[PDB]
Amino acid sequence: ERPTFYRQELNKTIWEVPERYQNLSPVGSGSVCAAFDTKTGLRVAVKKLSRPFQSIIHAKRTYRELRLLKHMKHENVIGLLDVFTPARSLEEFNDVYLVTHLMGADLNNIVKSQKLTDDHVQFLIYQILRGLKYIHSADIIHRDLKPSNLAVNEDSELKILDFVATRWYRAPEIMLNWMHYNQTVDIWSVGCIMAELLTGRTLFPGTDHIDQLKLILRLVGTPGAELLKKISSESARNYIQSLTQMPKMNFANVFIGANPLAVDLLEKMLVLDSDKRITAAQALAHAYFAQYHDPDDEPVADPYDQSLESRDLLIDEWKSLTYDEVISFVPPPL
Ligand SMILES: NC(=O)c1c(OCc2c(F)cc(Br)cc2F)nsc1NC(=O)NCCCCN1CCCC1
Ligand SMILES: CCCCCCCCO[C@@H]1O[C@H](CO)[C@@H](O)[C@H](O)[C@H]1O
Known part of the structure; x- marks a missing residue:
């Protein structure tokens, strides 16, 4: 008992x-x-x-x-x-x-700021996406994915955690308080993380909030026409207008002598327009992870109630509900 x-x-x-x-x-x-x-x-x-x-x-x-x-x-x-x-x-x-x-150890303690081999990046990033696919299938957005949220054992086996400048892996829309995030915020984060493992270097090391945004625009270029149409706020629209043109850099030169499959995946993750970023399910199917990919062992979650926590209730009800979760708990299958 x-x-x-x-x-x-x-x-x-x-x-x-x-x-x-x-x-x-x-x-x-x-x-x-x-x-x-x-x-x-x-x-x-x-x-x-x-x-x-x-x-x-x-x-x-x-x-x-x-x-x-x-x-x-x-x-x-x-x-x-x-x-x-x-x-x-x-x-x-x-x-x-x-x-x-x-x-x-986490992914600073593995990364030791030393660049990892392609095969190792492949494996680590594969697992992040496997994990993300599943979180995302639960209609859960992680929102703050980063090396220190990535736990890894001696054999390179990885787990995403909920728990280094903590803004370097944030989707640009999060930093602009856009407030209607896509799942592909996490994909942005994975892109920055992946870039970092391959190069040994933080990809966007902003010293402050606006510098961070500045470093990103250097890489991907400025909002193109079809993205610019989507700016709800006029003034942003209007500020972003008041910028000049600057075209995306060729990642192939940003990622010198990386596996071109990796570069090509970096290019699908690090798109300003969240609606055009590769999804986790799609990214797993990318020929970059051919050695690891298996479509029958990349499982989705049961769906999950987001609103059922966003109630306004009294402490005693939260406490009674938490109590019930503590009682009903059945340990995992070992
Ligand atoms: N997971 C862990 O081993 C751990 C941890 O888990 C908290 C925690 C729970 F207790 C229970 C649930 Br449920 C969730 C949850 F997040 N808090 S600290 C720590 N490990 C650690 O301090 N290792 C030695 C220092 C290396 C740095 N490491 C890298 C990864 C974590 C920090
Ligand atoms: C300063 C301009 C750079 C920031 C551009 C970020 C564009 C992110 O992408 C935007 O994300 C929104 C979800 O949050 C979607 O609803 C929009 O359709 C999508 O275009």
Whole structure:
């Protein structure tokens, strides 16, 4: 039934964890301990949520985190090994712990600013897209994909996480608060990430927000005619007007001696017009990933309720709902 729990002090707070989890050790600030799940053999990250039910917006966040994590069932996407609470009733619920695979390094810790081989980039980017295809099939946009959101083990096996200047991988529309994003915001991010692995260099290293935008326009050129027609705001329309022409650079010269398949994929991801960017499903089918591509093991998600978290409710209802998600949780198939 319910497992036995044990208590120990950690991070200015008492952690009450099941028995099966051992040698907890703080490895970040909620706050996280690294631990060994003796039950399963795995190294895990165990997250104690700081103040999950503080406000309407915290409680809302808790419930939405749990619900997304519980929905994420894919090799290339972080997923939940366990969720627990000491509480033996709702009356007494306030503490939430999440459990997932301990990961030792992210894509800065692999990248070491050294350029990777084509075959390695192929593999890493393949996995990102495999993972993205699936997130996107759930009508989930990630919105802030970047090396530090990309977890990787010693064998180059990758997982997308939700958690370096954090703006370098952002879709330009996000930085212009465009507010009706396509899924292809993530594709922009992958493009910048891919470019970086191949070259060893940040592709758009903006020092500030506008410089960032400036570096991008150097690469792709200025909004062409068909993109310019789409600017809702007049003044942008009008400012963007007041720029001069500058034509896209030839990526082949920007990416000197890269596999031309990679260049060609870079050219389909790094299109200003989000409506013209290659999708993840399409990019997986790109001849660049011929060695990895398999259309029968690149699985979609069950659909997922975006509005069901955007309710206006009272802390007690969020907390009751989160409680129900904690109770109903069934660990993944190992
Ligand atoms: N995943 C992990 O191993 C991890 C982690 O997971 C939090 C966490 C949960 F606890 C539970 C759920 Br559910 C989701 C979730 F994101 N917080 S820190 C950390 N790993 C770590 O500090 N390794 C040693 C330092 C290397 C830098 N690494 C690269 C990747 C992460 C930082
Ligand atoms: C300063 C001009 C550079 C920014 C151009 C960004 C164009 C991004 O693409 C735009 O994204 C929108 C979704 O957010 C779509 O609705 C538009 O149709 C699409 O053209």
